[PDB]
Design a protein around this nucleic acid. Structure first.
Ligand SMILES: [Mg+2]
Ligand SMILES: [Mg+2]
Ligand SMILES: [Mg+2]
Ligand SMILES: [Mg+2]
Ligand SMILES: [Mg+2]
Ligand SMILES: [Mg+2]
Ligand SMILES: [Mg+2]
Ligand SMILES: [Mg+2]
Ligand SMILES: [Mg+2]
Ligand SMILES: [Mg+2]
Ligand SMILES: [Mg+2]
Ligand SMILES: [Mg+2]
Ligand SMILES: [Mg+2]
Ligand SMILES: [Mg+2]
Ligand SMILES: [Mg+2]
Ligand SMILES: [Mg+2]
Ligand SMILES: [Mg+2]
Ligand SMILES: [Mg+2]
Ligand SMILES: [Mg+2]
Lengths: 63, 384, 134
RNA sequence: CAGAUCUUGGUGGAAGUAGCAAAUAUUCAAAUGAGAACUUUGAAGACUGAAGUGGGGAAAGGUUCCAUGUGAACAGCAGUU
RNA sequence: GAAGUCGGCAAAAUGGAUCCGUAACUUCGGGAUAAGGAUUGGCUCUAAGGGUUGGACAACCAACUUAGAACU
RNA sequence: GUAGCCAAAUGCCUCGUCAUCUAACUAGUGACGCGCAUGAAUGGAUUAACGAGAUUCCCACUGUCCCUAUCUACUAUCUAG
RNA sequence: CCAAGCGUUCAUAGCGACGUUGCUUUUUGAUUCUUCGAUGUCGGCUCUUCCUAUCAUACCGAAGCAGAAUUCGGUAAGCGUUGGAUUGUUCACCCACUAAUAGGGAACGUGAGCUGGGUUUAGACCGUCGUGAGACAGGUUAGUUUUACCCUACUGAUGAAGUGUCGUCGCAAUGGUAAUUCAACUUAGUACGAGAGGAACCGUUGAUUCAGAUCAUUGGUAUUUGCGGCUGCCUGACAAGGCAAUGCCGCGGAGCUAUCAUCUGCCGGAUAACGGCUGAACGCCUCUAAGCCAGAAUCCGUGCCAGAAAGCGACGAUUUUUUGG
RNA sequence: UGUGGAACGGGGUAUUGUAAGCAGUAGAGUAGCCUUGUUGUUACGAUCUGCUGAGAUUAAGCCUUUGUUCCCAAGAUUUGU
């Protein structure tokens, strides 16, 4: 019972959450919800959206 | 020409609103006198749905020893109180209730069942009967003796402790629960001894048991034949609407046949669904209600934020696999199975690996308050 | 039928008249689904395929020799998300298949792009030529 | 006279039924009054948006114009208008 | 993705402007916006294109375009 | 019955025959022609451009369909008149 | 029915002439009994039900090692009987899938159900015909598809009480009823077979079609006008807003919803075909003569839905010191 | 008159995606004035950064609440072995 991490938001992915997308270049993406999946397909950079953890890690939010 | 099966089942007719809400046991399991005395049914309340992960033990299956995800239904089942007994005599016109014996004291919630306005009433429901019980205690024993001599079928009168749930309704639900087991005298003796006593869910059912669930389905109001019966949508060009049946009958019989789909009531109907498997009988007194041998986190069976439109489940519960009739908080009748089960699917012991307790009020990502606090760190409100 | 065993129900994504990429090097590019094997009887319902399903197809773009004829093919990728028994909903970027003979042996020799696990378990010839599976 | 899809007049069941749903939209307070969703005043919210729901004419009408009153009939709900 | 249907009926899609590019055929006029591509905000600048007017020149006033650059 | 033209909006037989397109076409197009009953200002043939004309197909597109679901306004509905 | 015969050999495994007895016809025809003060007209779509003359599914019988293939052969209509290219079509042929793609009836089922491709004779073109107006075993193109608000039926929705009242818990007459089919693997390279090859009952894991729910997950939906973004104009600017008949775009809880999602869908009795037992007549033989077994997806029940609003029971309290009981 | 109710408020749960305001030379640059500077003051400048996982919304068919403030001990009809 392993818990994945969203490829866009970085949040914990418990079983049954979101969808898995496997791209043509064999790269597998796990999305926690439709918002993360939709944003990813809108070519959005997760590092530019403040609420994600990639933005928080890069910008050292919360020290 | 171009055959197709008829739409819907003629076995579920008429599709009128059920004449009841509770959920009626139409047939109790066949009585075996060789077994000990036991109950055959229980009343619960639909709290909500979640999902689990468990390891499948099914040899020959591609998912054998692999993890599967399953939706489950949580039914809140606080102990019921036995308040009476009814004896039935076998007659050539069917079973007939010979007499009914009640406990000396009945709680307020069950006495509310005998009133439309309990508050405005004088609360005179069993007051003269109660005095009889404490005058000589001899008409009670005589009535019980008559059930022993006659009355091949014995059923206890049991009611729910609805005040222990978060429901706004204070009037308890009361039902006859057939007593199956050894000997009519032992049924009556068992029943008398349980007057004003609680019977809890684990004394009725057990882990991995296959049961039936009886309830009244979600109300839908009226529906046209397209959704009520599943008929094909008529073309876009159809003058005067397309959510109907094109031809509702031939010439001769010069009458609309009862087998033709018609618009009408589409919900609130009585259904008994068979073969629900008990995945867990939770205990309301232990703080690891939703913990497993693989998920040691101390958590109970209430999602974050509470069950939507229900609240917190603080009592005993059952975790049936799959779906059940009716909406959240409708009272549901759980019945012992009438069938015998020997299939591998029915007989496989069920051991849960993980129970989801994330919020069902949205795309919730934290199982517990502690997990949320750790992932996010601190917030503006948390510091001060 | 007689692939390696059985396949769970999967959300169908490719009805008849759907056109999917050819994922192999057989010379074809444009599989056009004509029928789906195992399809029973249901008025007005289109036969539809999922990953791992054998279909009948024609080639619309590619080598002139491959065209104008019905051949078997196996779906290996699909865009419609389906549900695995472990609760995961997954999908690919495109719809693709490979030309096979009735026994399930690949007409081509290489497969470009990922291949669904359901297709790989059922058809070992596809699994042999598959690169990354799922 | 029982008849003529008879003539003229009167009156039924269908029935308190079909319906009175195009043109964005009304609200608050006051006055008057037996009575105010519909009158008048103030306030708000809106619309026509200059090829106007604005300002005039030709044709046609003929007093419909104005003031003061009235409120049976008419204004397919109402009426102090 | 037309499998629907007699039939793409209805709907969808296209759409302004600027710069590229534009087949058969032709009565040589057309076809043609054929087809088929790219671009388009905001801000801060640069260049060029005209008039009144003081002793090769000129301090204002009165002006409107077009093209381009950087930043975002 | 010449030049032309054609199973043509003119061919009964007829779903003519061959070829092409399609997985598959009594469609369509191209050919063929003893043409029931084509044919020369009763105008024959061809034709760029134009056409809310008829017909076949391809791309785009899409709830036409697989297979239905959801939402808004006005009705229907209940009330007063 | 008849039996000359084919069927190396055996007239009726399977074929079977000449005759002869019947059924049906959805064929135009025949007739002219109903309708001309008017019964809307093909096909398709949709939807239900019925018949059996059985394509498939269940069980049985006969021919030859199995394996099969035929007689679907006998019962049997419970349950299925498809996606397309075409035909306006009916019919039909074609590509496929499928366990299988059986045939019919219901005013040639079905137009106040649609659609209007057919028919559709008003406009128009052609061929043949006609001196002409015009015509047609023809071809072509364009051509308004009205009304339920009545009775009944059907679908759902309330409901008076003389048999006390109002409740609670029940019974059950009667009506309805539901599941279906497939694949792979074990059996098993086994029974069987010179060899090649090659099963079956059962079991398991899945799947099709149907049925009843449900909304944890996933997907769709957006007046959550919830949050954010955008253009034009308007409130002097900022901020905050408004208008643009829901202005437009992203995400969007809740709800609703998806074979786009998930859950669940038995066993008892009597039989048919047909096969056995005890047993005769017709002193033997033989399933029948009486009887007893066995026996199908058949039928009837249990189970599931309704619950007689004029079928019924058990139980609770009985207008309160006014007045009624 | 009750472990009563309601209206608010608080906590939780969700959705969005970082509010207004103030500050910073962060900012393509540009123009005026000076002691003339690897922080030159000055003014304009889409935007950027920080306070700020902020702010807003959160039952309308979410959960919870010992918080606050109010409310109710009422009328009418019928029914008897
Ligand atoms: Mg119409
Ligand atoms: Mg939820
Ligand atoms: Mg169809
Ligand atoms: Mg008279
Ligand atoms: Mg007379
Ligand atoms: Mg008359
Ligand atoms: Mg009305
Ligand atoms: Mg306007
Ligand atoms: Mg305006
Ligand atoms: Mg004027
Ligand atoms: Mg496409
Ligand atoms: Mg078609
Ligand atoms: Mg079709
Ligand atoms: Mg159109
Ligand atoms: Mg031709
Ligand atoms: Mg001449
Ligand atoms: Mg109506
Ligand atoms: Mg019955
Ligand atoms: Mg305005």
């Amino acid at each position: 019972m392993k818990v994945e991490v969203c490829s866009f938001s970085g949040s914990k992915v418990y079983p049954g959450a979101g969808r898995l997308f496997v791209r043509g270049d064999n790269k597998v993406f796990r999305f926690v919800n439709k918002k993360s999946e939709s944003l990813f397909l809108q070519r959005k950079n997760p590092r530019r959206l403040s609420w994600t953890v990639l933005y928080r890690r890069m910008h050292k939010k919360g020290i | 020409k171009f055959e197709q099966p008829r739409h819907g089942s003629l076995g579920f007719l008429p599709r009128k609103r059920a004449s009841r809400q509770r959920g009626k046991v139409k047939a109790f399991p066949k009585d075996d006198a060789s077994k000990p005395v036991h109950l055959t049914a229980f009343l619960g309340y639909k709290a909500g749905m979640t999902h689990i992960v468990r390891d499948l033990d099914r040899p020959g299956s591609k998912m054998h020893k692999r993890e599967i995800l399953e939706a489950v239904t949580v039914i809140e089942t606080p102990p019921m109180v036995v308040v009476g007994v009814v004896g039935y005599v076998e007659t050539p016109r069917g079973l007939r209730s010979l007499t009914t014996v009640w406990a000396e004291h009945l709680s307020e919630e069950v006495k509310r069942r005998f009133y439309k306005n309990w508050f405005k009433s004088k609360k005179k429901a069993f007051t003269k009967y109660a005095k009889k019980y404490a005058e000589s205690t001899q008409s009670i024993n005589r009535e019980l003796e008559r059930i022993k001599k006659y009355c091949s079928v014995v059923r206890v009168l049991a009611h729910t402790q609805i005040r222990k749930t978060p429901l706004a309704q204070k009037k308890a639900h009361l039902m006859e629960i057939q007593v199956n087991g050894g000997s009519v005298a032992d049924k009556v003796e068992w029943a008398r001894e349980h007057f004003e006593k609680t019977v809890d869910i684990k004394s009725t059912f057990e882990q991995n048991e296959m049961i039936d669930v009886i309830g009244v389905t979600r109300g839908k109001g009226n529906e046209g034949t397209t959704a009520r019966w599943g008929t094909k949508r008529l073309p876009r060009k159809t003058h005067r609407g397309l959510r109907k049946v094109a031809c509702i009958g031939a010439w001769h019989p010069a009458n609309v046949q009862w087998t033709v789909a018609r618009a009408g009531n589409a919900g609130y109907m009585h259904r008994t669904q068979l073969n629900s498997k008990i995945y867990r009988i939770g205990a309301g007194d232990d703080a690891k209600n939703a913990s497993t041998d693989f998920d040691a986190t101390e958590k109970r069976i209430t999602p974050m934020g509470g069950f939507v439109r229900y609240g917190v489940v603080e009592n005993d519960f059952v975790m049936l696999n799959g779906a059940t009739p009716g909406p959240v908080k409708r009272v549901l009748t759980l019945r012992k199975s009438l069938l015998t089960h020997t299939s591998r699917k029915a007989l496989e012991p069920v051991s849960l690996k993980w129970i989801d307790t994330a919020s069902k009020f949205g795309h919730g990502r934290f199982q517990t308050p502690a997990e949320a606090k750790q992932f996010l760190g601190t917030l503006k409100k948390d510091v001060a | 039928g007689a692939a390696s065993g059985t396949k769970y129900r999967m959300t169908l994504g490719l009805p008849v008249q759907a056109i999917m990429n050819c994922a192999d090097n057989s010379g074809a590019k444009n599989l056009y689904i004509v029928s789906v094997f195992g399809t029973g009887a249901r008025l007005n319902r289109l036969p539809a395929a999922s990953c791992g399903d054998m279909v009948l197809a024609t080639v619309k773009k590619g080598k002139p020799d491959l065209r104008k004829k019905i051949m078997p093919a196996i779906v290996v990728r699909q865009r419609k998300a389906w549900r695995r028994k472990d609760g995961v909903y997954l999908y690919f970027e495109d719809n693709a298949g490979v030309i096979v003979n009735p026994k399930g042996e690949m007409k081509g020799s290489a497969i470009t792009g990922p291949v669904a696990k359901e297709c790989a378990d059922l058809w070992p010839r596809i699994a042999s030529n598959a690169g990354t599976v799922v």
